[PDB]
Amino acid sequence: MQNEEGQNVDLYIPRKCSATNRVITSKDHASVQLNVGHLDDKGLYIPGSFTTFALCGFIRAQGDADSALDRLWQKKKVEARQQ
Amino acid sequence: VRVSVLNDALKSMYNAEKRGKRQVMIRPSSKVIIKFLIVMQKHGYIGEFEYVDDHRSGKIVVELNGRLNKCGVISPRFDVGVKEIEGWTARLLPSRQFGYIVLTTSAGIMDHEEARRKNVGGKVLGFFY
Amino acid sequence: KWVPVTKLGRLVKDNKIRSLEQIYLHSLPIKEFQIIDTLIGPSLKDEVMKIMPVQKQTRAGQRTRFKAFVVVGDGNGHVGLGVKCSKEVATAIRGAIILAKLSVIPVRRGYWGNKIGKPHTVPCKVTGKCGSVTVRMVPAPRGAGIVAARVPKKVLQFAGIEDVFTSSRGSTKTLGNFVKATFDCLMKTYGFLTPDFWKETRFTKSPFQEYADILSK
Amino acid sequence: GRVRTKTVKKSSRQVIERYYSKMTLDFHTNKKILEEVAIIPSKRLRNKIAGFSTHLMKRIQKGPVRGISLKLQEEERERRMDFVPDESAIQTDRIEVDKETIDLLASLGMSELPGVVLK
Amino acid sequence: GRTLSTKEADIQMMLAAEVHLGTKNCDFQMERYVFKRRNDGIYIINLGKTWEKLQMAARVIVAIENPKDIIVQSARPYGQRAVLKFAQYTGANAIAGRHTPGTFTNQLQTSYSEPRLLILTDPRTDHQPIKEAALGNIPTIAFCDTDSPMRYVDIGIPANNKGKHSIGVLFWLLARMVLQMRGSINQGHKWDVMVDLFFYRE
Ligand SMILES: [Mg+2]
C-alpha cells in the first residue's frame, strides 16, 4: 500500500506461502521457512547460496506441504541448473 | 435440479481455491460462464482456462492463481441501474479500492467500473475479489 | 535485572533486533514481555477493562477468583489483549498486563477512498468471532469517527484507527467474548490478500539464521 | 509397611552417584561412609539411607539401575557399543528381490545392478 | 569393471537393507512415492525418489550454519543408535527415547530448546515432537513409510523406517551425503565409517 505521493504506508509486507499464496500472519506459528542449498560442479555446498521456500500453517496442517515443496524444488532446481 | 450453471461453476472455483488446488473443473460450460471467466482473467484473478469439447454442453479447466478471495453468484439477477452501482458495490465488495461486480448489460457482460464508464445498466450476475 | 531465556530475547537485549516488524515478518513466537517493553514499551499504554469474579463450588463453600481483562496499545497500529485469573485482583491485573504485552499484534490500516495522508480506517471489511459474539468492521470515510460500543471503541482507539463502522451480533454483554471478537477482527486485518500484495515475496534471512553465530555462544 | 520416602531414595541415589568408588556391600561400612561424606540430621535417617544404598549397590552389581548414572558403566557400555564386526552385516554380493522390485529397477534403468537376482 | 555411480551403489545398499519394503497399507499422501503393490499386498517404494529426497534433505541440512541448531530424535529403540551416530558425525544434537512434552514450548523448562531443524525417524511414533514443532515455526524432516502421516512433515523421505538395517543405512547415507556436501570427506559411495555402527545391536 502506498500514498498518493508514493510513500510506503504499510507497517510491513508479510510473506506469502510458496504453494498456496496465502498471507503468512504474525501469529502463524505453524508456518516454516526453508533454505535449500546449491551445489557446484563437484557436489560441494556454496555458502550463502540457496533457494528459500515458505509454507503457511494451513498447508502443513493438511499434510500437503511435502508434495508441494517437492514440486517447487524440482521446478526451481530445473530453472537454477542444480543437478 | 440444476438451476444456475454459473453458480455451480463459481462455487466450484471458490471451494477449490480455498482448498488450494491449482486446477478446477467446471461442468457444464456456458457462454455466460466463459464471459465471467474472461472478466476475471482480465484483472489477473485467474490463469489460463481451457474449454473441452464433448459434443455436449462442454467442460472447462481453470488454472487458479491463488489471488481469488471469493467469487459468487447473485440470485435472482436484480435490475441494476447506473445509479444503483454504488449501493451494490457497498453491499457486496470488501472495499472501494478493489473488487468487481459483474453485470450483464445490453452492451455485454462487463464489470461494474466499465459499466460506470459507458453509463450502461443491466442485471447483476455475480462478484469476485 | 533481566536474563533472557530465548534466542529472540537474547537478540532483543543485544540490540540485534530493533523493531517489532522484524519479529512479525517471520511469525516468531514472543515468550518474554521484556522484549515488548524494550521494543515498544515507552509508547505503550494499558487499561483495565473489567474485573470479573468467578467461583468454583467446593465441599466447604465457594472459592472465588477474579478475572482481569487488560488492553494495551500504542495508538499507532499495535494492540494487545490479556486475560488472567488469580485469587487477588492485583495479581490478576499484573498477569493480564503481562499477557496483553505478550500478545501485541500489528494492525493494518487503510484508506476508505482517496489515498492522501496516513491511513485512517480498516483496509477492508473484516469480521471477528468469539463464542456467539460476532464483530464486523466496515471502512468509513474520513470524519465519520469510531461508531462502536465502548469496549470495541476502546480497543479500536488503542489500535490507532480513526474512523470505522461496526456491527455486533450475539451476547455482547459477555465482555470477554466481545473484546476477544474485536481483537480477532483486528488481527484478521493483515491476513486478507489484496491486489497490492500480489507481488512475489522476496524472502530475507530469519533472525535465528542471520545472527546464528552470535546465538552460537 | 516399609517404603522408603523420596528423601531416602534421592539421598541414596546421589550418594551412590558421587561416591561409587568407595561404596561396599556391607551395611555398617556404608553407614560409616555416609557419616563421613554426608550430613544427616538424624541417626535413623542415616541408617535408612545406608540400607537403601546397600540395596542399590547390590542391584547395580547385577547390572544397570535406572535413575543412577555411573561414569564407569556408561564408558564401558560406550566402549563395547562402538565396536564393529570384521565383516559388515550387509551382503551386496547376492540380493534376492521379488519381480516387482525388478520392474522397479528396470523403470529406474538399474536393471544391471550386480548381485540382484529374482527368487 | 564398469564401476557403479554413487546413486547405483546407494540404491544397491538400500536394496540390501530392504529399504524398499513398505507395509500393507499406503497413506494417500505417500502414494506418489510408492511404485506398485505386489501380489502379497506389500507396497514397493520407489528407491529413486528415496535417493532424491535424501539428497534434498542433505541440501537442507548443509545450509544450517550451526549444526547444534539441528535436533534428530528417535522414539523407537532401533533408531536410537542411528540417531546418536548421525548426531556424532554430522555434529548435531540427538535425543534418544521419550520426548519430554513442552521441550519446544515451555521456555522455563530446563530442557527447553529452539532448534532450527528437526529430523525424525518415524512420524507415527514421533507424533508429539511434530505437534510441538508445529507450535514453534520449526521445519521438519522425517523418514516416512507407506502408512506414515504426512501432517506437519516438510521433507518426507520415503523409506522403510521400521527395520534396524534400513534405519541404520538411511541415517548412514544421510550423514555421508551431508559430510560430502560440507566437503570434509571424499565424494562417492565409499565412507570410512562402518555402516553397522548405525545398526541396532542386542
Ligand atoms: Mg438459462
mmCIF file with all atom_site columns, N, CA, C and O in Angstrom, chain E residues 73-103:
data_model
loop_
_atom_site.group_PDB
_atom_site.id
_atom_site.type_symbol
_atom_site.label_atom_id
_atom_site.label_alt_id
_atom_site.label_comp_id
_atom_site.label_asym_id
_atom_site.label_entity_id
_atom_site.label_seq_id
_atom_site.pdbx_PDB_ins_code
_atom_site.Cartn_x
_atom_site.Cartn_y
_atom_site.Cartn_z
_atom_site.occupancy
_atom_site.B_iso_or_equiv
_atom_site.pdbx_formal_charge
_atom_site.auth_seq_id
_atom_site.auth_comp_id
_atom_site.auth_asym_id
_atom_site.auth_atom_id
_atom_site.pdbx_PDB_model_num
ATOM 1   N N  . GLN E 1 73  ? 15.861 -37.031 16.621 1.00 0.00 ? 73  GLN E N  1
ATOM 2   C CA . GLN E 1 73  ? 15.420 -37.898 17.703 1.00 0.00 ? 73  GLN E CA 1
ATOM 3   C C  . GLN E 1 73  ? 14.654 -39.088 17.150 1.00 0.00 ? 73  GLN E C  1
ATOM 4   O O  . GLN E 1 73  ? 13.995 -38.998 16.111 1.00 0.00 ? 73  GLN E O  1
ATOM 5   N N  . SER E 1 74  ? 14.749 -40.206 17.864 1.00 0.00 ? 74  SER E N  1
ATOM 6   C CA . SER E 1 74  ? 14.047 -41.434 17.519 1.00 0.00 ? 74  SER E CA 1
ATOM 7   C C  . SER E 1 74  ? 13.341 -41.965 18.756 1.00 0.00 ? 74  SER E C  1
ATOM 8   O O  . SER E 1 74  ? 13.971 -42.150 19.802 1.00 0.00 ? 74  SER E O  1
ATOM 9   N N  . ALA E 1 75  ? 12.035 -42.201 18.637 1.00 0.00 ? 75  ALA E N  1
ATOM 10  C CA . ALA E 1 75  ? 11.285 -42.774 19.749 1.00 0.00 ? 75  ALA E CA 1
ATOM 11  C C  . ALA E 1 75  ? 11.526 -44.273 19.877 1.00 0.00 ? 75  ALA E C  1
ATOM 12  O O  . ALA E 1 75  ? 11.605 -44.797 20.993 1.00 0.00 ? 75  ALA E O  1
ATOM 13  N N  . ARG E 1 76  ? 11.646 -44.974 18.751 1.00 0.00 ? 76  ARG E N  1
ATOM 14  C CA . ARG E 1 76  ? 11.775 -46.421 18.774 1.00 0.00 ? 76  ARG E CA 1
ATOM 15  C C  . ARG E 1 76  ? 13.195 -46.840 19.161 1.00 0.00 ? 76  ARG E C  1
ATOM 16  O O  . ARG E 1 76  ? 14.159 -46.118 18.894 1.00 0.00 ? 76  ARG E O  1
ATOM 17  N N  . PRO E 1 77  ? 13.344 -48.007 19.797 1.00 0.00 ? 77  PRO E N  1
ATOM 18  C CA . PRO E 1 77  ? 14.691 -48.456 20.189 1.00 0.00 ? 77  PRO E CA 1
ATOM 19  C C  . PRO E 1 77  ? 15.637 -48.667 19.019 1.00 0.00 ? 77  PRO E C  1
ATOM 20  O O  . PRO E 1 77  ? 16.846 -48.451 19.169 1.00 0.00 ? 77  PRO E O  1
ATOM 21  N N  . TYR E 1 78  ? 15.130 -49.094 17.859 1.00 0.00 ? 78  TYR E N  1
ATOM 22  C CA . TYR E 1 78  ? 16.015 -49.443 16.752 1.00 0.00 ? 78  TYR E CA 1
ATOM 23  C C  . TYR E 1 78  ? 16.783 -48.231 16.242 1.00 0.00 ? 78  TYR E C  1
ATOM 24  O O  . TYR E 1 78  ? 17.980 -48.327 15.946 1.00 0.00 ? 78  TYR E O  1
ATOM 25  N N  . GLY E 1 79  ? 16.119 -47.087 16.126 1.00 0.00 ? 79  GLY E N  1
ATOM 26  C CA . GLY E 1 79  ? 16.741 -45.905 15.568 1.00 0.00 ? 79  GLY E CA 1
ATOM 27  C C  . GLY E 1 79  ? 17.563 -45.074 16.524 1.00 0.00 ? 79  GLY E C  1
ATOM 28  O O  . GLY E 1 79  ? 18.150 -44.072 16.102 1.00 0.00 ? 79  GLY E O  1
ATOM 29  N N  . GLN E 1 80  ? 17.623 -45.447 17.802 1.00 0.00 ? 80  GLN E N  1
ATOM 30  C CA . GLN E 1 80  ? 18.351 -44.640 18.777 1.00 0.00 ? 80  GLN E CA 1
ATOM 31  C C  . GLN E 1 80  ? 19.842 -44.609 18.466 1.00 0.00 ? 80  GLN E C  1
ATOM 32  O O  . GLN E 1 80  ? 20.470 -43.542 18.478 1.00 0.00 ? 80  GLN E O  1
ATOM 33  N N  . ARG E 1 81  ? 20.430 -45.771 18.181 1.00 0.00 ? 81  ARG E N  1
ATOM 34  C CA . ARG E 1 81  ? 21.847 -45.807 17.842 1.00 0.00 ? 81  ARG E CA 1
ATOM 35  C C  . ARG E 1 81  ? 22.114 -45.050 16.549 1.00 0.00 ? 81  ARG E C  1
ATOM 36  O O  . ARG E 1 81  ? 23.123 -44.345 16.426 1.00 0.00 ? 81  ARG E O  1
ATOM 37  N N  . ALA E 1 82  ? 21.215 -45.182 15.573 1.00 0.00 ? 82  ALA E N  1
ATOM 38  C CA . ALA E 1 82  ? 21.386 -44.482 14.306 1.00 0.00 ? 82  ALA E CA 1
ATOM 39  C C  . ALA E 1 82  ? 21.385 -42.972 14.511 1.00 0.00 ? 82  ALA E C  1
ATOM 40  O O  . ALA E 1 82  ? 22.238 -42.262 13.966 1.00 0.00 ? 82  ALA E O  1
ATOM 41  N N  . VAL E 1 83  ? 20.439 -42.460 15.300 1.00 0.00 ? 83  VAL E N  1
ATOM 42  C CA . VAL E 1 83  ? 20.377 -41.017 15.517 1.00 0.00 ? 83  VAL E CA 1
ATOM 43  C C  . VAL E 1 83  ? 21.577 -40.548 16.329 1.00 0.00 ? 83  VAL E C  1
ATOM 44  O O  . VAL E 1 83  ? 22.117 -39.461 16.090 1.00 0.00 ? 83  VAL E O  1
ATOM 45  N N  . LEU E 1 84  ? 22.019 -41.353 17.299 1.00 0.00 ? 84  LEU E N  1
ATOM 46  C CA . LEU E 1 84  ? 23.204 -40.984 18.068 1.00 0.00 ? 84  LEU E CA 1
ATOM 47  C C  . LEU E 1 84  ? 24.421 -40.859 17.160 1.00 0.00 ? 84  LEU E C  1
ATOM 48  O O  . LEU E 1 84  ? 25.172 -39.880 17.237 1.00 0.00 ? 84  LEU E O  1
ATOM 49  N N  . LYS E 1 85  ? 24.627 -41.843 16.280 1.00 0.00 ? 85  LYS E N  1
ATOM 50  C CA . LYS E 1 85  ? 25.763 -41.783 15.363 1.00 0.00 ? 85  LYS E CA 1
ATOM 51  C C  . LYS E 1 85  ? 25.628 -40.618 14.391 1.00 0.00 ? 85  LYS E C  1
ATOM 52  O O  . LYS E 1 85  ? 26.618 -39.947 14.073 1.00 0.00 ? 85  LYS E O  1
ATOM 53  N N  . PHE E 1 86  ? 24.413 -40.366 13.899 1.00 0.00 ? 86  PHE E N  1
ATOM 54  C CA . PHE E 1 86  ? 24.207 -39.249 12.987 1.00 0.00 ? 86  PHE E CA 1
ATOM 55  C C  . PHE E 1 86  ? 24.571 -37.930 13.652 1.00 0.00 ? 86  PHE E C  1
ATOM 56  O O  . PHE E 1 86  ? 25.247 -37.089 13.052 1.00 0.00 ? 86  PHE E O  1
ATOM 57  N N  . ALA E 1 87  ? 24.135 -37.732 14.897 1.00 0.00 ? 87  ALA E N  1
ATOM 58  C CA . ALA E 1 87  ? 24.499 -36.516 15.614 1.00 0.00 ? 87  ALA E CA 1
ATOM 59  C C  . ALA E 1 87  ? 25.999 -36.455 15.861 1.00 0.00 ? 87  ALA E C  1
ATOM 60  O O  . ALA E 1 87  ? 26.608 -35.383 15.766 1.00 0.00 ? 87  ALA E O  1
ATOM 61  N N  . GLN E 1 88  ? 26.615 -37.596 16.181 1.00 0.00 ? 88  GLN E N  1
ATOM 62  C CA . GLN E 1 88  ? 28.046 -37.611 16.457 1.00 0.00 ? 88  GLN E CA 1
ATOM 63  C C  . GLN E 1 88  ? 28.846 -37.170 15.238 1.00 0.00 ? 88  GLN E C  1
ATOM 64  O O  . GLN E 1 88  ? 29.776 -36.363 15.351 1.00 0.00 ? 88  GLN E O  1
ATOM 65  N N  . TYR E 1 89  ? 28.498 -37.687 14.060 1.00 0.00 ? 89  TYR E N  1
ATOM 66  C CA . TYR E 1 89  ? 29.304 -37.412 12.875 1.00 0.00 ? 89  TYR E CA 1
ATOM 67  C C  . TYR E 1 89  ? 28.925 -36.104 12.187 1.00 0.00 ? 89  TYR E C  1
ATOM 68  O O  . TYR E 1 89  ? 29.811 -35.363 11.749 1.00 0.00 ? 89  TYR E O  1
ATOM 69  N N  . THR E 1 90  ? 27.630 -35.797 12.075 1.00 0.00 ? 90  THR E N  1
ATOM 70  C CA . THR E 1 90  ? 27.226 -34.541 11.452 1.00 0.00 ? 90  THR E CA 1
ATOM 71  C C  . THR E 1 90  ? 27.452 -33.354 12.379 1.00 0.00 ? 90  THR E C  1
ATOM 72  O O  . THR E 1 90  ? 27.627 -32.226 11.905 1.00 0.00 ? 90  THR E O  1
ATOM 73  N N  . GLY E 1 91  ? 27.446 -33.578 13.688 1.00 0.00 ? 91  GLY E N  1
ATOM 74  C CA . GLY E 1 91  ? 27.667 -32.520 14.649 1.00 0.00 ? 91  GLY E CA 1
ATOM 75  C C  . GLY E 1 91  ? 26.418 -31.900 15.242 1.00 0.00 ? 91  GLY E C  1
ATOM 76  O O  . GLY E 1 91  ? 26.519 -30.833 15.857 1.00 0.00 ? 91  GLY E O  1
ATOM 77  N N  . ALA E 1 92  ? 25.257 -32.527 15.080 1.00 0.00 ? 92  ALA E N  1
ATOM 78  C CA . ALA E 1 92  ? 24.005 -32.010 15.607 1.00 0.00 ? 92  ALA E CA 1
ATOM 79  C C  . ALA E 1 92  ? 23.735 -32.598 16.991 1.00 0.00 ? 92  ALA E C  1
ATOM 80  O O  . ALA E 1 92  ? 24.573 -33.284 17.582 1.00 0.00 ? 92  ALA E O  1
ATOM 81  N N  . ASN E 1 93  ? 22.545 -32.318 17.514 1.00 0.00 ? 93  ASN E N  1
ATOM 82  C CA . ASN E 1 93  ? 22.099 -32.846 18.795 1.00 0.00 ? 93  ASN E CA 1
ATOM 83  C C  . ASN E 1 93  ? 21.142 -34.011 18.581 1.00 0.00 ? 93  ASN E C  1
ATOM 84  O O  . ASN E 1 93  ? 20.347 -34.021 17.638 1.00 0.00 ? 93  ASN E O  1
ATOM 85  N N  . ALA E 1 94  ? 21.222 -34.991 19.476 1.00 0.00 ? 94  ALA E N  1
ATOM 86  C CA . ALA E 1 94  ? 20.398 -36.188 19.411 1.00 0.00 ? 94  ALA E CA 1
ATOM 87  C C  . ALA E 1 94  ? 19.605 -36.344 20.700 1.00 0.00 ? 94  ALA E C  1
ATOM 88  O O  . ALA E 1 94  ? 20.102 -36.041 21.788 1.00 0.00 ? 94  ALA E O  1
ATOM 89  N N  . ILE E 1 95  ? 18.368 -36.816 20.566 1.00 0.00 ? 95  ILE E N  1
ATOM 90  C CA . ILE E 1 95  ? 17.509 -37.139 21.699 1.00 0.00 ? 95  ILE E CA 1
ATOM 91  C C  . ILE E 1 95  ? 16.946 -38.528 21.443 1.00 0.00 ? 95  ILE E C  1
ATOM 92  O O  . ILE E 1 95  ? 16.080 -38.703 20.578 1.00 0.00 ? 95  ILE E O  1
ATOM 93  N N  . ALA E 1 96  ? 17.433 -39.515 22.187 1.00 0.00 ? 96  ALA E N  1
ATOM 94  C CA . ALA E 1 96  ? 17.019 -40.902 22.033 1.00 0.00 ? 96  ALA E CA 1
ATOM 95  C C  . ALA E 1 96  ? 16.090 -41.283 23.174 1.00 0.00 ? 96  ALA E C  1
ATOM 96  O O  . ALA E 1 96  ? 16.428 -41.089 24.346 1.00 0.00 ? 96  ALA E O  1
ATOM 97  N N  . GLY E 1 97  ? 14.922 -41.820 22.829 1.00 0.00 ? 97  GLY E N  1
ATOM 98  C CA . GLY E 1 97  ? 13.965 -42.253 23.825 1.00 0.00 ? 97  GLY E CA 1
ATOM 99  C C  . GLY E 1 97  ? 12.724 -41.389 23.868 1.00 0.00 ? 97  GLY E C  1
ATOM 100 O O  . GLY E 1 97  ? 12.302 -40.840 22.846 1.00 0.00 ? 97  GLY E O  1
ATOM 101 N N  . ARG E 1 98  ? 12.126 -41.264 25.050 1.00 0.00 ? 98  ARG E N  1
ATOM 102 C CA . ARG E 1 98  ? 10.908 -40.481 25.192 1.00 0.00 ? 98  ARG E CA 1
ATOM 103 C C  . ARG E 1 98  ? 11.214 -38.992 25.089 1.00 0.00 ? 98  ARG E C  1
ATOM 104 O O  . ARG E 1 98  ? 12.239 -38.513 25.582 1.00 0.00 ? 98  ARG E O  1
ATOM 105 N N  . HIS E 1 99  ? 10.311 -38.261 24.445 1.00 0.00 ? 99  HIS E N  1
ATOM 106 C CA . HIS E 1 99  ? 10.425 -36.818 24.288 1.00 0.00 ? 99  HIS E CA 1
ATOM 107 C C  . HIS E 1 99  ? 9.596  -36.134 25.366 1.00 0.00 ? 99  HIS E C  1
ATOM 108 O O  . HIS E 1 99  ? 8.409  -36.436 25.527 1.00 0.00 ? 99  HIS E O  1
ATOM 109 N N  . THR E 1 100 ? 10.217 -35.224 26.099 1.00 0.00 ? 100 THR E N  1
ATOM 110 C CA . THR E 1 100 ? 9.526  -34.534 27.180 1.00 0.00 ? 100 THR E CA 1
ATOM 111 C C  . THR E 1 100 ? 8.576  -33.492 26.603 1.00 0.00 ? 100 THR E C  1
ATOM 112 O O  . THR E 1 100 ? 9.028  -32.586 25.890 1.00 0.00 ? 100 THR E O  1
ATOM 113 N N  . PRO E 1 101 ? 7.272  -33.567 26.875 1.00 0.00 ? 101 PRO E N  1
ATOM 114 C CA . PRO E 1 101 ? 6.362  -32.533 26.369 1.00 0.00 ? 101 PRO E CA 1
ATOM 115 C C  . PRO E 1 101 ? 6.745  -31.157 26.893 1.00 0.00 ? 101 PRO E C  1
ATOM 116 O O  . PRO E 1 101 ? 7.178  -31.005 28.036 1.00 0.00 ? 101 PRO E O  1
ATOM 117 N N  . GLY E 1 102 ? 6.578  -30.149 26.040 1.00 0.00 ? 102 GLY E N  1
ATOM 118 C CA . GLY E 1 102 ? 6.955  -28.796 26.380 1.00 0.00 ? 102 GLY E CA 1
ATOM 119 C C  . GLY E 1 102 ? 8.409  -28.459 26.141 1.00 0.00 ? 102 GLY E C  1
ATOM 120 O O  . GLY E 1 102 ? 8.829  -27.342 26.465 1.00 0.00 ? 102 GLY E O  1
ATOM 121 N N  . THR E 1 103 ? 9.191  -29.385 25.586 1.00 0.00 ? 103 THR E N  1
ATOM 122 C CA . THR E 1 103 ? 10.598 -29.107 25.322 1.00 0.00 ? 103 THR E CA 1
ATOM 123 C C  . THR E 1 103 ? 10.772 -27.954 24.343 1.00 0.00 ? 103 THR E C  1
ATOM 124 O O  . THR E 1 103 ? 11.766 -27.226 24.416 1.00 0.00 ? 103 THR E O  1
#
